Amino acid sequence: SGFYHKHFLKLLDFTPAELNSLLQLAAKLKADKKSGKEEAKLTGKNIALIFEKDSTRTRCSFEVAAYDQGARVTYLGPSGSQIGHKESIKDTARVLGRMYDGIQYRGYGQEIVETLAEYARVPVWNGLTNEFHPTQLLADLLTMQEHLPGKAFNEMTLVYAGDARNNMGNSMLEAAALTGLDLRLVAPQACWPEAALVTECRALAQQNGGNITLTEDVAKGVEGADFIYTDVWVSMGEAKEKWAERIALLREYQVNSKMMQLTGNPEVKFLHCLPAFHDDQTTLGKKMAEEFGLHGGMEVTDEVFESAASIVFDQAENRMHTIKAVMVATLSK
Amino acid sequence: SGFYHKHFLKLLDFTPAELNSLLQLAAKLKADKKSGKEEAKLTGKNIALIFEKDSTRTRCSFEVAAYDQGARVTYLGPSGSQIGHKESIKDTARVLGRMYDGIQYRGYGQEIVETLAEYARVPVWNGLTNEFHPTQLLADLLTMQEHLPGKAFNEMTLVYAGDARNNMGNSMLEAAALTGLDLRLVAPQACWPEAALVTECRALAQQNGGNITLTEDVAKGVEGADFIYTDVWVSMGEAKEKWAERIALLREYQVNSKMMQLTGNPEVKFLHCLPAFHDDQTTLGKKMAEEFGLHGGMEVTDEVFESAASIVFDQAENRMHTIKAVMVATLSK
Amino acid sequence: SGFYHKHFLKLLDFTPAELNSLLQLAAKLKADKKSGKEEAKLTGKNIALIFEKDSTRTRCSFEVAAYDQGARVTYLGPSGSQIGHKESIKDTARVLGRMYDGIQYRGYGQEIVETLAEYARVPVWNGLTNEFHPTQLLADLLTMQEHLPGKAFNEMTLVYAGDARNNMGNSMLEAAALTGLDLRLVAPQACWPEAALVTECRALAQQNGGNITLTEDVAKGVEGADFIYTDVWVSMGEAKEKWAERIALLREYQVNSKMMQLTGNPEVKFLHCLPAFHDDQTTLGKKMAEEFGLHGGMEVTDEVFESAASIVFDQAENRMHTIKAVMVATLSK
Ligand SMILES: N[C@@H](CCCNC(=O)CP(=O)(O)O)C(=O)O
């Protein structure tokens, strides 16, 4: 409806109704692809994909969703083009807008994608920025909805442990402000999200029947949750130095078994946007695990990651249907 | 006509008539895409795109132009494949020719793309080499033609300030030799193009009614110009060290407002192939701007870049129609 | 037949009949594309292509073969995505399987691609691993078959000089075990393939009428060969240090003219999977050539590489038909 040629930069630029419509379209599109009745809508549209940070899911998601819908893609990865920086984003935008029908941007800081959106004159979607990550939450919302049918979002309790001031924390706030989820940010105070945003989002959440609780206590936070959610303690783009202090702060907020048990709900499902350092298998996974001693998981224990509660791969699948939905909504009819 | 299976390496391998035909086809194709009546011609053709230097426009241009025409693309960026060097270009060519229908090459030095063309046995297009950049000029010629209708090229005066011995300077010469433009290369003598090429191109320009003037004087050069054109003072692939001496030489050749005023034509339009360091916004843009003191523009002032005279983004758009034209001309019927 | 949803990790996971069927399909598909009667089978299938080592042929091959068959491709090159390592291959697999219909993997070590195949739940093809390279041999087998018509594989003598314990040596063994080729691995003992595999493959080769001979003597090895085959002395992923000892060992195993002459067959054709350091033209080609003194070729003399015996470019072309065949076999009907 009021989606055609709209950008998708952060969730609060949308009404509850818009978000819900979107979520509904995504769900249709998912269902259409499994039934094989997918009607391509974006045929002959060309989309540029600017990536300044790495990505497996978000990139792949944009690519297959476009290919299904009959669109083609151009991946301008981190350093390959002039956009790396040797040219204004303002110029880049004005260039790409003359050739493409839509642009994705993954990067550093909302200023960039906003500037990219003013000047491009085509829909700009936020693939993840330093502050927000709207596309993720769409997928998470739907995944939450698919695992608790017949429940409105205001009937669900979502807990987010970990670093609450990263792009994911910020995005949670927006989600709740639009859905009335009972958000619970279990984090040390040092990692709490900026208060101006909490206030705005809290006010809006309560209007819709939710409430944003922030608390350093794990035990009163996780209680009664339908979902536990967490993320890496240092995000993409933050300095390597942060690891030593972030582990120091956040390790009592690890989503472990005891953690899942303090919930009290045996039906509680775990969520994680991924990548997740859950085992002593990776490159910096093993290095961090021996050094500080996070044996068997950092933000989440490997036992919980491979638990029946873990629905992260469903969540992960839902990234692409969600993005397909955003794209057919902003580019068609 | 005598285009099918021809390479596009430098402009002087074409007749004035050929160039003009090409320009005409481009114009048709542009018009067809805006009207939505674009008939795809390159369906089922596969094209490799070798890039050894960066690119936003040229790469994107090749990609969307192919996608529109129903062709697919394979981007072999700077280091990813064996072509980086671990294998002869001679071998690379012979390999790729067995799989693709056409090959683009962006790189260092004409020898490379020529060798690539002898051995590939499919059309090879020059995406930019150290010496030439033919594809650009096609677009610029058309953009010039679209802003001064009812004017033959011999009725137009084009000034090129800046480093006249880069790939762009060299390309100007070819353009004039084929169009009878009144070329004016306003540059310090130290940056003048190689005399052998000037002579050959001058002779040819004059035959077609033009003349290539070289001069260190800004004032007598810019006078009566229909277009001012410029480019970065150090090109891709040149050593970082060159910046200090090139700024030293070329800063009086900055295209600024006074510069545009000495023209005497109030209808004069500015052109720049881009990227352009016109503001104190970029990475090395700001570093260069404080150090040497180019506040508010290096080759071109930001005031002129955002001037109503600036038609650089039209120019930029015209890169892809032009390339689409080259490709349908060399690959179809 | 028993190909749909099968992985293609190493050749010995297939019967002689399966290999031969495959080879036959490839041959059809080749023929169909030249006649222009190619019926696309993989329309609307999306394929991820994980590359951790470089590639020109294998990547290009996967791309055009997919494009011909109406499929689209996503290239996740060496470091761009999270797969580089920051995430388990086990997780990566489970993610990609939810989005794609098939996955290619080029990398380091068979464990990786096997783990990738257990967890992905879609066909996984081995683009080259440290130990095997099955896709190559398919192409080589067909190329061998196209140059000696009316000859069953058991009627052919294939010699492989050089480093017999790389991924290519190992693959030869598998090929013979399935075809009854008279394999001859002419190599120093220090470079002989692991005996457990030789034994298994020898037993199988003999059943089918072949025999795997290993020998340090060049002269008795090359005698009566229909094909001489060789490869670079240090493979992708091995330490740069190995060059000095590998040249020391292997230079008497260079495929030179005298080498081709000791064969005794004047119809003997040369094969090489490529890249080949055959001239003093490359980056590390020239550096190695002056230092150790391999003037005019390392594994193979440039004279032999450009000889009429050289059919390496036919071989190279046959990489993509072969891969197209693997893909339509594992993804269709
Ligand atoms: N705060 C985290 C969020 C990662 C989001 N993950 C994704 O979007 C999945 P992807 O990396 O595969 O696209 C960070 O910035 O590191």
Ligand SMILES: N[C@@H](CCCNC(=O)CP(=O)(O)O)C(=O)O
């Ligand atoms: N002499 C300049 C020319 C740049 C040409 N620009 C383009 O082709 C536009 P692009 O870089 O976006 O493809 C140089 O070599 O740096």
Ligand SMILES: N[C@@H](CCCNC(=O)CP(=O)(O)O)C(=O)O
């Ligand atoms: N043992 C060699 C094998 C190279 C195989 N070559 C290919 O697959 C051709 P490509 O590199 O163009 O894909 C090595 O590992 O270096």
